[PDB]
Design a protein around this ligand. Structure first.
Ligand SMILES: O=C(Nc1cccc(Br)n1)[C@@H]1SCCN1C(=O)Cn1ncc2ccccc21
Length: 228
């Protein structure tokens, strides 16, 4: 998270860390007791290794009572996802067993009604992604409040040149943004999951290239289908 604050310890119980060989790769959001929603390209450059979801954390390294590592029993990518495109950049991970729910582990209600988030709405994106352009990996959870940018502005040739589909949404990127490793993370507006940070390689902190987030309500039927 570029230009953000450190998150309040365990204030976002839905928050998950998709890790490979004890190193954080992507953010994730607990959508059900045994399901974590993330991005489709998080396990791409992955070598022979242990893929695990960390729940109940604030610090990745320090011990916490709430912290629990889970094995990925099933990794369901969106059928229409491709490595080449940021479209349908969703991946549902089923945990080895149901998550032990508590004040620090609670699934987030995700938007089921397909309505665009009103441009200007202040949304909260959190993650353990790089905090500076030098690539400093934060140990503790970080977050930033970004206003939703309208698709028309986002699709300008100077911006994303029509790449933002009706299934995607945007947020402002002037210094304050989401970045590398924030991918797969949640975009929460009014305590409800609206977007998922894309795992597509982009350029953070520049206002002319806004943040791209996959609208969950746009893929509500697929999520429902998988979780059942
Ligand atoms: O690269 C990734 N994770 C990573 C790398 C270094 C440091 C940290 Br913290 N996390 C994940 S796994 C493969 C796709 N990923 C992305 O973060 C993709 N992505 N998402 C935004 C972004 C910006 C610049 C470059 C890549 C970007």
């Amino acid at each position: 998270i570029l230009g953000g604050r450190e998150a309040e310890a365990h204030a976002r119980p839905y928050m998950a860390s998709v890790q490979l060989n004890g190193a954080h790769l992507c953010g994730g959001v607990l959508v059900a007791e045994q399901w974590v929603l993330s991005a489709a390209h998080c396990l791409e450059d992955a070598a022979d290794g242990k893929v695990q979801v960390l729940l109940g954390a604030h610090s990745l390294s320090q011990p916490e009572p709430s912290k629990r590592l889970y094995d990925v029993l099933r990794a369901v990518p969106h059928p229409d996802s491709q490595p080449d495109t940021i479209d349908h950049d969703l991946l549902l991970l089923q945990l080895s067993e149901k998550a032990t729910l508590g004040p620090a582990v609670r699934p987030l209600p995700w938007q089921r009604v397909d309505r665009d988030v009103a441009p200007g709405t202040l949304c909260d994106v959190a993650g353990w992604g790089i905090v500076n352009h030098a690539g400093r990996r934060p140990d503790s959870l970080q977050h930033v409040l970004l206003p939703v940018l309208d698709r028309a502005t986002c699709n300008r040739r100077t911006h994303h040149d029509g790449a933002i589909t009706e299934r995607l949404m945007c947020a402002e990127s002037n210094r304050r943004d989401s970045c590398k490793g924030d991918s797969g993370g949640p975009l929460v507006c009014g305590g409800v999951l609206e977007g998922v940070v894309t795992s597509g390689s982009r350029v953070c902190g520049n206002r002319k290239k806004p943040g791209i987030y996959t609208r969950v309500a746009s893929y509500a039927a697929w999520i429902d289908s998988v979780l059942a």
